[PDB]
């Protein structure tokens, strides 16, 4: 539990941009294995992650450091590449979102404080 | 060239740590599909990437911005998750190397 300037940047600049992205919709809430017909999803992906959870964690001061939050973004993208087929559209959507994420992390203010 | 603080950091901190890491050896050179019995590899992965390529690029000032080196690290790790079976050891190795990549990139100086 902290507020830092890098966490505020991950919340208000990085997450805000990804959330609104036209490819974001499959990532805004936990993967619903039942709705989507994916009875194997929880057998392959042991640490489900989604932007909903990351956003809420940011609002409830769950993270102590930015890096912890960046790690959750990474798990979410990684789950998607691991579980889905190479040819599924969701893989392209994840890769596009993940490039923005890396671009925006590159401009994160670097006085790590609060 | 002068090398921006960011590419300096990617070279002297990020690549420094990954290059010598005990999980690094499968990533140090381009995936050799013939050596590894992997006739489908280039069918699935259209942009192969590896640490040798990125290390050489950082050494020869091939890069204009950090974000472009960072993308190459990302492609390398993503290739690996996309091609390989979830249960493969290589997947666990890549996940460990990628966490270090992100930890370090959390402390990369500002641009400019």
């Amino acid at each position: 539990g902290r507020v830092t300037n890098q966490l505020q940047y991950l919340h208000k600049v990085v997450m805000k941009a990804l959330w609104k992205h036209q490819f974001a919709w499959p990532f805004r809430q936990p993967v619903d294995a039942v709705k989507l017909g994916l009875p194997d999803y929880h057998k392959i992906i042991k640490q489900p992650m989604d932007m909903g959870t990351i956003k809420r964690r940011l609002e409830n001061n769950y993270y102590w450091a930015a890096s912890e939050c960046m790690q959750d973004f990474n798990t979410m993208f990684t789950n998607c590449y691991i579980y889905n087929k190479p040819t599924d559209d969701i893989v392209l959507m994840a890769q596009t979102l993940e490039k923005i994420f890396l671009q925006k992390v590159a401009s994160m203010p670097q006085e790590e404080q609060e | 060239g002068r090398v921006t603080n960011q590419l300096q950091y990617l070279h002297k901190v990020v690549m420094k740590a990954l290059w010598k890491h005990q999980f690094a050896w499968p990533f140090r050179q381009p995936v050799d599909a013939v050596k590894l019995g992997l006739p489908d590899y280039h069918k699935i992965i259209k942009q192969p990437m590896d640490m040798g390529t990125i290390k050489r690029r950082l050494e020869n000032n091939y890069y204009w911005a950090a974000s472009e080196c960072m993308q190459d690290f990302n492609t390398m790790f993503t290739n690996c998750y996309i091609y390989n079976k979830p249960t493969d050891d290589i997947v666990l190795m890549a996940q460990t190397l990628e966490k270090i990549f992100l930890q370090k990139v959390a402390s990369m100086p500002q641009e400019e």
Partner: peptide, 10 residues
């Protein structure tokens, strides 16, 4: 589509 063939498991 799907997961290639892979490098080996554990």
């Amino acid at each position: 589509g799907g997961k290639g063939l892979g490098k080996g498991g554990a």
